[PDB]
Structure 1
Amino acid sequence: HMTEYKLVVVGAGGVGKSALTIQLIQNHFVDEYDPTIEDSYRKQVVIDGETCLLDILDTAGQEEYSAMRDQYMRTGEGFLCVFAINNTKSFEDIHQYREQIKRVKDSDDVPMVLVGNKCDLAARTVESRQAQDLARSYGIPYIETSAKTRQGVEDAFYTLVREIRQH
Structure 2
Amino acid sequence: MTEYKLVVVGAGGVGKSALTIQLIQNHFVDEYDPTIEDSYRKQVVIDGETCLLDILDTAGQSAMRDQYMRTGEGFLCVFAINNTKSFEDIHQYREQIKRVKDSDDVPMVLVGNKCDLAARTVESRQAQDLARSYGIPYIETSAKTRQGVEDAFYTLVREIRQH
Shift of residue 48, structure 1, vs aligned partner: 0.8
* Alpha-carbon distance change, 54 to 32 in structure 1, aligned in 2, over 3 angstroms: farther
Q: Which residue of 2 aligns with 1:144?
A: 140
1:115 and 2:111 are equivalent in the alignment:
yes
Contact 1:11 1:17 in 2 (8 A): yes
Contact 2:22 2:146 in 1 (8 A): yes
Contact 1:22 1:33 in 2 (8 A): no
* Alpha-carbon distance change, 97 to 52 in structure 1, aligned in 2, over 3 angstroms: same
Shift of residue 37, structure 1, vs aligned partner: 13
1:27-56 deviation line (CA, Å, top 9, x unaligned): 369999999999970000011111110000
Shift of residue 120, structure 1, vs aligned partner: 6.5
1:103-135 deviation line (CA, Å, top 9, x unaligned): 000111101110110176353101111111110
1:82-107 deviation line (CA, Å, top 9, x unaligned): 00100000000101100100100011
1:129 and 2:128 are equivalent in the alignment:
no
Q: Which residue of 2 aligns with 1:57?
A: 56
Contact 2:5 2:72 in 1 (8 A): yes
* Alpha-carbon distance change, 116 to 110 in structure 1, aligned in 2, over 3 angstroms: same
Range 39-48 or range 53-62, more displaced: 39-48
Shift of residue 14, structure 1, vs aligned partner: 2.6
DSSP 3-state at the match of 1:37: coil
Contact 1:4 1:52 in 2 (8 A): yes
Q: Which residue of 2 aligns with 1:30?
A: 29
Contact 2:28 2:143 in 1 (8 A): no
Using the size of structure 1 for normalisation, the TM-score is 0.87
Contact 1:5 1:54 in 2 (8 A): yes
Contact 1:102 1:110 in 2 (8 A): yes
Shift of residue 72, structure 1, vs aligned partner: 2.0
DSSP 3-state at the match of 2:38: helix
Shift of residue 61, structure 1, vs aligned partner: 5.3
Range 74-83 or range 121-130, more displaced: 121-130
Contact 2:6 2:53 in 1 (8 A): yes
Gapped runs of 5+ residues in structure 2? none
Contact 2:18 2:30 in 1 (8 A): no
DSSP 3-state at the match of 2:64: helix
Contact 1:113 1:141 in 2 (8 A): yes
Range 119-128 or range 99-108, more displaced: 119-128
2-structure distance, mates of 1:84, 1:37: 19
CA RMSD of aligned residues (A): 3.0
Shift of residue 149, structure 1, vs aligned partner: 0.3
